[PDB]
Amino acid sequence: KNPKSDKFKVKRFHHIEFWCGDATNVARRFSWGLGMRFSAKSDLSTGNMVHASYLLTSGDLRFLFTAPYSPSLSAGEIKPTTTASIPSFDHGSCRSFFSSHGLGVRAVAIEVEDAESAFSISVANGAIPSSPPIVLNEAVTIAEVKLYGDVVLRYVSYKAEFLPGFERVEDASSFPLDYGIRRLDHAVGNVPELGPALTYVAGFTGFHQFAESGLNSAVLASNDEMVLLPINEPVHGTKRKSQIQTYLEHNEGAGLQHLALMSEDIFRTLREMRKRSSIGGFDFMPSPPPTYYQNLKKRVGDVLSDDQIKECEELGILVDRDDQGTLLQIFTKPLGDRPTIFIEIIQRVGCMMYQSGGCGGFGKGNFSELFKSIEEYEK
Amino acid sequence: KNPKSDKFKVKRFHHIEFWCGDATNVARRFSWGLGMRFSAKSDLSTGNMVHASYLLTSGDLRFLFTAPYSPSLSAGEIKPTTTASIPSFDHGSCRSFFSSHGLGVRAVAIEVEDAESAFSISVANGAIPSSPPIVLNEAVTIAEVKLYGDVVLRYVSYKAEFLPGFERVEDASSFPLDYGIRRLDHAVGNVPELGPALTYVAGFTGFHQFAESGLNSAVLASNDEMVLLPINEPVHGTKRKSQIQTYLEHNEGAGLQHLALMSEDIFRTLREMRKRSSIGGFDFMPSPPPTYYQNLKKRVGDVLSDDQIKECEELGILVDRDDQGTLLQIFTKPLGDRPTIFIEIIQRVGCMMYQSGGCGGFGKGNFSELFKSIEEYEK
Ligand SMILES: Cc1nn(C)c(O)c1C(=O)c1ccc2c(c1C)n(C(C)C)c(=O)n2C
Ligand SMILES: Cc1nn(C)c(O)c1C(=O)c1ccc2c(c1C)n(C(C)C)c(=O)n2C
Ligand SMILES: [Co+2]
Ligand SMILES: [Co+2]
Numbered sequence A, B: 001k002n003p004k005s006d007k008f009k010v011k012r013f014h015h016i017e018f019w020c021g022d023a024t025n026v027a028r029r030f031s032w033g034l035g036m037r038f039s040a041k042s043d044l045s046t047g048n049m050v051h052a053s054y055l056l057t058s059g060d061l062r063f064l065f066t067a068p069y070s071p072s073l074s075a076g077e078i079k080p081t082t083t084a085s086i087p088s089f090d091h092g093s094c095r096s097f098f099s100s101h102g103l104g105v106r107a108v109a110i111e112v113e114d115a116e117s118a119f120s121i122s123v124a125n126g127a128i129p130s131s132p133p134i135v136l137n138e139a140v141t142i143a144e145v146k147l148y149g150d151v152v153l154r155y156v157s158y159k160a161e162f163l164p165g166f167e168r169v170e171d172a173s174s175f176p177l178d179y180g181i182r183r184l185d186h187a188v189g190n191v192p193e194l195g196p197a198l199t200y201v202a203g204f205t206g207f208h209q210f211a212e213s214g215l216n217s218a219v220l221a222s223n224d225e226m227v228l229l230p231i232n233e234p235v236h237g238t239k240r241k242s243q244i245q246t247y248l249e250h251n252e253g254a255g256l257q258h259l260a261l262m263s264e265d266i267f268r269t270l271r272e273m274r275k276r277s278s279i280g281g282f283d284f285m286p287s288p289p290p291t292y293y294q295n296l297k298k299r300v301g302d303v304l305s306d307d308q309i310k311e312c313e314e315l316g317i318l319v320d321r322d323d324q325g326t327l328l329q330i331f332t333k334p335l336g337d338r339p340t341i342f343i344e345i346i347q348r349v350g351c352m353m354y355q356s357g358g359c360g361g362f363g364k365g366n367f368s369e370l371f372k373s374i375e376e377y378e379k
Helices: A023-034 A091-101 A115-124 A194-205 A243-251 A266-275 A290-300 A306-315 A365-378 B023-034 B091-101 B115-124 B194-205 B243-251 B266-275 B290-300 B306-315 B365-378
Strands: A010-019 A037-042 A051-058 A061-068 A104-112 A129-136 A140-148 A151-158 A181-190 A215-221 A228-234 A255-263 A318-321 A325-331 A342-350 B010-019 B037-042 B051-058 B061-068 B104-112 B129-136 B140-148 B151-158 B181-190 B215-221 B228-234 B255-263 B318-321 B325-331 B342-350
Touching: A010 A091, A010 A151, A010 A181, A023 A037, A023 A051, A023 A061, A023 B023, A061 A091, A061 A181, A091 A104, A091 B091, A104 A115, A104 A255, A115 A129, A115 A140, A115 A151, A115 A194, A129 A151, A140 A194, A181 A243, A181 A342, A194 A215, A194 A228, A228 A243, A243 A255, A255 A266, A266 A306, A266 A325, A266 A342, A290 A306, A290 A318, A290 A365, A318 A365, B010 B091, B010 B151, B010 B181, B023 B037, B023 B051, B023 B061, B061 B091, B061 B181, B091 B104, B104 B115, B104 B255, B115 B129, B115 B140, B115 B151, B115 B194, B129 B151, B140 B194, B181 B243, B181 B342, B194 B215, B194 B228, B228 B243, B243 B255, B255 B266, B266 B306, B266 B325, B266 B342, B290 B306, B290 B318, B290 B365, B318 B365
Parallel strands: A010 A061, A104 A151, A181 A228, A255 A342, B010 B061, B104 B151, B181 B228, B255 B342
Antiparallel strands: A010 A104, A037 A051, A051 A061, A129 A140, A140 A151, A181 A255, A215 A228, A318 A325, A325 A342, B010 B104, B037 B051, B051 B061, B129 B140, B140 B151, B181 B255, B215 B228, B318 B325, B325 B342
């Protein structure tokens, strides 16, 4: 059941912004590890005396990495005279965020028809304002409201080329890496209490709820279910400590837990990423035992051939099924020093009309199947 | 003239420590860009609840990357019960350093015969103490005094395997990269006033002075001239703004300007580094004009063949000569967001007895020769 209750017109995920201590080193690491190209910059060389911002792209996926300069470089500026390309940026907020949480996502940005209307409707419906709507070069409008913890939901709308004040990256520094990642599928938050978090976000967006292990969760979705925002809470008192609780402890509270990146060829993406794990890229969680891939024949034997199942086993890929589609997924180890944010690589098969959002679910069935596999491999 | 006036026995450079916001991403970027292997760690997985520290090695070169965890993880600890592997570490100092200077060198570490005696003699001779001598597992002693700005000179001595509490890195995560870098040749500081900086450092070490462009500089050296610590000050009032002054502005004061890394085969190192510049590694300063390499025939035609001169031209390598040896060198663009710290790759030819320290100088003649080359190429 999809009541299509969005309180304003939402299009697609637009970008994810990481707040960093040094944007250069994080962006270069991510570029090589994920196969994303350097496509735009806003920094000292573009006249920005406030923050260094670097944009990586793969397909429609946009990752922005931002760090503050010394405040002394811009001490004479005021907001009317700022050289910052992102007017919501604040030195103190960024330093406070990074000292509190470490490397992590500050903004989940969605493209909307009208960022000023989106902001006004959200705040009229309970959203806590973070940055009021600001029109950039009479071309783009940006506004921000609080999502959870110190993460903001950023609205971007275009009258008619990332943002004004960003420059295209020169082709010499713009090596055309591509491991097959094409877009953001979903962005997941961890909170101490799921109920109040869901009520708050669904309250100001009109997003609807989309259709033992240490977590309870729920998924909020836009009208066409292309913007997907799951939220998790921990389950206490279990034998094994909840990984959601571990997140909250090491992150100093609520924040973004994982980004799921859709691949157009998850086999190629994982081959390319795994080749680079020990040479500057990303590590992956330990692979399931062979009993898992043996049991996959009975579960997904009508969707994947035996060869493709064998290809899943080489790469450590997980498979899950809903009533409408099938999910291939795998998880990285945490992206930085703290056991907090990580990345999921996903590919979905089924639900063709284009492919509808959330085809195959989010893999919650893999908890029990991994468990059964571990017990079976112990035998 | 070498008066051999060291006030305590100094051996060699031991390691360089960077203070980071996220040590994982910086260390992974540096590993791929410079061809250094992950060799040791001290972090949550080794019981360290205080800081994450990762050691990269290439030959005798040791780069350490350290970042703080949330103070909440260690809030119940006191110094007698600390889980930190580097007892001088302090959360507040590290956050203050990074917010002030950005990514940069906190410690220049030299191995000495007795770190406690080195500390006591230094402080008795004017050194400002930073961290008193601490014996680690009855095996290693570490102590720190201020060098310039917020950079410390760290003394390490071994009774008889980086530091106690560091664990060797498992071979799966330890990919054997190697682009030919073998050791630290020199470490250079930028200060506002050279005189007082030299007097201070030479005062407490007994290091001696080793044998138009925007800088004045001088080099301090240990007895065998294997530890080399140049210091620069800006020259004001020139047409072009001093790059030393630019450093001081963007760094918020004095600090380490560049690390010069000796290669056993600078041609291989530069081929390997340049292949990776646009895929996560390091960029290099713009190459000199072809008139430079034409003029090199008359300057170094007796040391390098025409083919090897042509190889220098492909890779953008600079060449300088002293009275005793020849210097091949090249400089990276800044390592992070700010126009502050960069790296020099160096190889020295001549002065064989082993090779004596500082063979060929430090390349100051390349200022005039680059200038002449630029005017000649304008023609
Ligand atoms: C669950 C869940 N709910 N929603 C809305 C999602 O997007 C998810 C997941 O992406 C997911 C699915 C299966 C997992 C898993 C995750 C994070 N992890 C990590 C290590 C915790 C596992 O070990 N397994 C087996
Ligand atoms: C000088 C100097 N003194 N000492 C003690 C050193 O180690 C040096 C250098 O390493 C050096 C030599 C030549 C240079 C240079 C540097 C840093 N730069 C940078 C961009 C400023 C140039 O453009 N040229 C031509
Ligand atoms: Co997921
Ligand atoms: Co040098």
